[PDB]
Chain length 250, copies 6
Amino acid sequence: SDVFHLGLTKNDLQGAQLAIVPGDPERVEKIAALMDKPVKLASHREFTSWRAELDGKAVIVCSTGIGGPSTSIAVEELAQLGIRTFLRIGTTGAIQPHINVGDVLVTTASVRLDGASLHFAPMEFPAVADFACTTALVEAAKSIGATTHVGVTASSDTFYPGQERYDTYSGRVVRRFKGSMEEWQAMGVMNYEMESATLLTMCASQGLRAGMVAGVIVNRTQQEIPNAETMKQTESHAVKIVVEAARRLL
Amino acid sequence: SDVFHLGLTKNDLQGAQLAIVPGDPERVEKIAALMDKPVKLASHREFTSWRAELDGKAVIVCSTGIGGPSTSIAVEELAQLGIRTFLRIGTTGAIQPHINVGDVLVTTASVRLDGASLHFAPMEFPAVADFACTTALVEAAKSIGATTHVGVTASSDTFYPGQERYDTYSGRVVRRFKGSMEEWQAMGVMNYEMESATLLTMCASQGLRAGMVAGVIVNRTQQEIPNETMKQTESHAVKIVVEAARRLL
Amino acid sequence: SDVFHLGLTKNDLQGAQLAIVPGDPERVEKIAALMDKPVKLASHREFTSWRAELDGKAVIVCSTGIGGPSTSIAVEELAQLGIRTFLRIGTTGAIQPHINVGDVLVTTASVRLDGASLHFAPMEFPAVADFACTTALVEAAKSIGATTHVGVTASSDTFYPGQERYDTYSGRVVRRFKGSMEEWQAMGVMNYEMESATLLTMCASQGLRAGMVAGVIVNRTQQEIPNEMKQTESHAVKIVVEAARRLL
Amino acid sequence: SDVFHLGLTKNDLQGAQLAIVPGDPERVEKIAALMDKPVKLASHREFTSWRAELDGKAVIVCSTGIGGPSTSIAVEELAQLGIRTFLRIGTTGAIQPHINVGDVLVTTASVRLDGASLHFAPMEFPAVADFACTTALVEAAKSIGATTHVGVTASSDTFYPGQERYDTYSGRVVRRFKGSMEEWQAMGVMNYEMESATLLTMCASQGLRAGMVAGVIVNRTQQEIPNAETMKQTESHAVKIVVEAARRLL
Amino acid sequence: SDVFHLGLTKNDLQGAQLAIVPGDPERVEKIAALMDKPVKLASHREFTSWRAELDGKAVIVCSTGIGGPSTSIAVEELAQLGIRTFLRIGTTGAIQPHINVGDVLVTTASVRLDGASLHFAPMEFPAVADFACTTALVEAAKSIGATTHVGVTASSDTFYPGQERYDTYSGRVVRRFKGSMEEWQAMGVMNYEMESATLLTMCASQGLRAGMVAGVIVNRTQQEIPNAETMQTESHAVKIVVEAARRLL
Amino acid sequence: SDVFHLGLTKNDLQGAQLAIVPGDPERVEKIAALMDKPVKLASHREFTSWRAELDGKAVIVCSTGIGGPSTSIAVEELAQLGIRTFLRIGTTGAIQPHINVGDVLVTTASVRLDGASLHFAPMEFPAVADFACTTALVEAAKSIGATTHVGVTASSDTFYPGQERYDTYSGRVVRRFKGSMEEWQAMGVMNYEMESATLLTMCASQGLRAGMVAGVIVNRTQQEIPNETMKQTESHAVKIVVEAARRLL
Ligand SMILES: O=c1cc[nH]c(=O)[nH]1
Ligand SMILES: O=c1cc[nH]c(=O)[nH]1
Ligand SMILES: O=c1cc[nH]c(=O)[nH]1
Ligand SMILES: O=c1cc[nH]c(=O)[nH]1
Ligand SMILES: O=c1cc[nH]c(=O)[nH]1
């Protein structure tokens, strides 16, 4: 193997320079299945990688696991392998009242509430998306007619206290994050997720292009935990546009 | 008049919802000269304001002065008067070897080396431009014709030590900024300016739209102090910001 | 079905109080197999979970994935289900010339080079392991007679720049971490790993007991590539299982 | 010109080593009018400069514009031109109930609510005024006849949120500055202005002497809002004092 | 004299490698009295030293005074003279209701609410006790049948605001420490003291072994006042720290 | 008796409003011996107190001990008993080549290299001396013909690493303080001491007046062997602080 964690060689990518990167390893197959000639490559830890084709050119689907650390491994080793463009597709909790579950959110930049981003650039540096990648994602969403919101995302290193969840074992939230939800909301932040900050920072500061899109699974102005179903075709809207966006970026 | 610093009433804007915000008060007139019905409004401190017309729509040109603090004043007070879209036209110093004098740089987001941005959002918040504003700016660059680069800019509260300039009185730079320029360069940061961090942070965190464009007047990998410049380079970037404004009405 | 990520219930745990938390989903089965009545419970994302028994007492084995974010989810949801004791068993890179590959490292407290720990307590709070858990781990290592070092661990949010690696895509390390490995060496830090700061902080801040043990797979000073990590892993797997036995 | 922004040459200074540095470019002439043989030198951007004579010695008056960034350029470039001593005359908002409109305030040191000071010294460094300059201003105030208070100032990078003003477009103040005015009030801080922290730090950390005086145009604990008396007697009062102070620093 | 403050030489230690380090200089003798051949060494400022023998080996007892800055001088200059193990014995105020007077507290690690800590290691570094030292203290505590609590201690640079006391001159607490006791209580912190964060951090980062035991004098949450005497518990913690020293020689 | 640590009552102060605050307990009597009706008050820990008289007004002399934590206790409890003005007299190490052994340094404000100051005010707040106290001290120093320097001083929570001394057990200094002395020198910082940051911050932020004067006992740039020099230098500063106190009653 050419890399330590993913168990891949450069030949496995077959010249691919773009990668679609979900959090869940179990979604890699699902996304590769929407493209031509899907071929499984490897599965190690939380890193499941598939190869596929789009307009005759090769593309990589590869999971990152939850959080910046595992993402930082995935992106780095993938980049050592020849990928220059990364498109994250994820699930998200919306913090604005008008955003409906199922909607697609395109991230221009992220509130760095993580730790891995600091390992690539100091906090002054913006966790900003690539312009071509964001453009491709916005245009893809329009040519599909999906309810799309585009703006700032709060990217947290936890699922619970960092996203101000109170339905927990302790039931408390550290000072830093007490009332932080209503603050991001007043600041026009759309949503919470867990990988965009580190992904966006590490790419923007290393000459790599990155885009970020997610489907809403819960609205946090209403509840902390969703009940709604997951595996049908509802959040496939975000998946369809990330594949369509990948087309334009080849 | 309705606001503390700008000497303007809400009636002065005539329904205007977009402002173009140059740093230099003397360039306000030049920008207005490229639009229909340019009328001088007010001149107070570093805040020179003109009103104009684009395609039957009112537009404001108002200077901000150098730096986030006076920038934060102009924007706030222009927002109180009804402005919701801000386009900054400035001058800049390229950090990358491949970016030449005359080039047009559009800012997607900026490195926050300012203090005023902290007065609207904590440091983890991105100093990010509005997507529609950036789009129009990039699209306007194609229209006018310009060698254009798009990306991250370092927005400094100082012209000298924050941009690691050594042509100074002291000849020294504080620890935080020792070797900082070639660190920004390695991170792909394209230029140094002085207002974008404040403008972008304050707008994006307050539901206002903002965009940033600038003409390069010096390349730092070869010189510190800039050295014909504005005569054509300013007019160039100005034509772009005006064209971008058309697309945002 | 109760907890959102793990897909587990109170009942699946069978009144278990202790959980062993490796980073690798593949190591979960291996650890549970060393105990009595091993039974798979669930597998979602990077969280694969098993139940087993030590001396008639139910014990959970649940992976965390790589990093503090995924660790934090696992520990939290396990706590909702009744787990009060957490034992991490991991792999690590030694940064002291006298700690070679195959050695066992017990962490007293961690250098907090993560982000998730700050979501539970401010940086001034120590990322410290529970005393009973640490005691159990040291004693179990002596019981099998392993080469054991006890001390502080640098817990990084990245495998590469945070642990000061230059053999990368860009080859650069941000100012904060430039020369940092020499600093940790000078300060007597034993090793780099990627989950302890989050685990130890969130547990010490919430009334949970936690201990950290790791087998050395690489030494950051030496010029040597892995030889049987497999020998080291199953070795440390015995220590953590034997430690859990004392904590029930 | 010898400098990039200011449009001034060393000859323009005529051997001057003292600068009076108001915020407002329109005040430059007013200040120079209290001295002998005032002549306009230059006007560029926010930087309007005048030369005048005080007790036979050459003295520069030069505007800084609002904020630390503008101040940092002016002071740097004046220093390049030969200036060693800087006197700030400004307007301010008093925050203590006992300090009235029309009072004169001399700053010994400032709370650094700016970003430009960090470009000259870390936060732990004091934004402290030079002893001689401060002495000259205390004596001048007493020589002119004024109600004078001496102490700590809050130097903010914003007029609004950093000074906890709420009647704004957004109506909100960022966490950092929520209840901040009440805290500074409890800490004995007497006023808000916008350039002392930058000026005091960059001078004290570079062997330059700096002084800070301001006239109270508003009190944040009172409902009464003056006048024309803002730019009126109060402004004129402080201007007389700064000129009188300059006489003792030649 | 070999060192700047303590007024001691290498010879004065007689090959001692362990030091017991109380806060109060008045307590140094009492501790040394429990051991063989107690002899005063020196007394300068807040640092009063005594030498004793324990099971044949030489042992130093030396005061640090109040706070990290003085502690860092004692520990530094003692280390220069050949001291490798440091054991802190003090008195403390419990912040947890279940902790009563007469209870002993062993500190595994400390909350770094001090300043001197940062002069040895960045805030990221844990203010952690040495394992052998901690084990020894818990064993020695158990061997005298003491009610022992093991865990995290909050180490403050101040007695008043950093421990969130309002019964003061100003009656105010700075933002940082406003509501901070409730937070530490929720996080399971046992008590406040003023010297551990410095001792633990500087030792754990320089290859020196450190540990801390403390007797509870008062409780910040309990109504009941200490009896005919406060400090019965005083002599126990001293006996504990002396007994722990034995296992570490 | 009215306080927890100092062992004083308001009655002991006899309506005193100014205190002189050295670090060393032994200097307390010496400062008092230059005034009228000097009398011992109390001695607990590193807090030795004396009351004297000057022009019919009671004056307190009280030791703080080494460091901010110790100082914060003394200053707080003195303030509870009625002291409003605090004058610190100390020994110091100059870092400027132009500052010589035996020179007299008056502190306008201090670099906050401490932790205790943060317990009273956030880092943005200046550790500044009161103007009247600074004036009195400068005015007092010229009256007896001292060679005087008036400026900023670095106030460190450690004697060693924070003042960037390398002749230590470990021989190392944290990144934060590597090359820090050279940077303070370039910034115009006069000297190193260990109490002013805490004293000045807590006084300036609580409506208390404070100042500091010190005498130079070592220069960190050259090898001037410390000769009686400490004796004569201390005597001159002690005279200065008492003469300054006279002007503040
Ligand atoms: O609420 C949510 C949903 C998905 N991912 C998150 O981080 N938060
Ligand atoms: O170099 C430059 C040029 C213009 N503006 C800046 O801020 N820097
Ligand atoms: O070097 C290593 C080996 C394992 N895990 C790490 O985090 N680093
Ligand atoms: O409130 C005020 C008044 C004048 N200047 C300021 O900076 N603030
Ligand atoms: O160098 C010195 C001398 C005296 N006091 C200090 O703190 N440092």
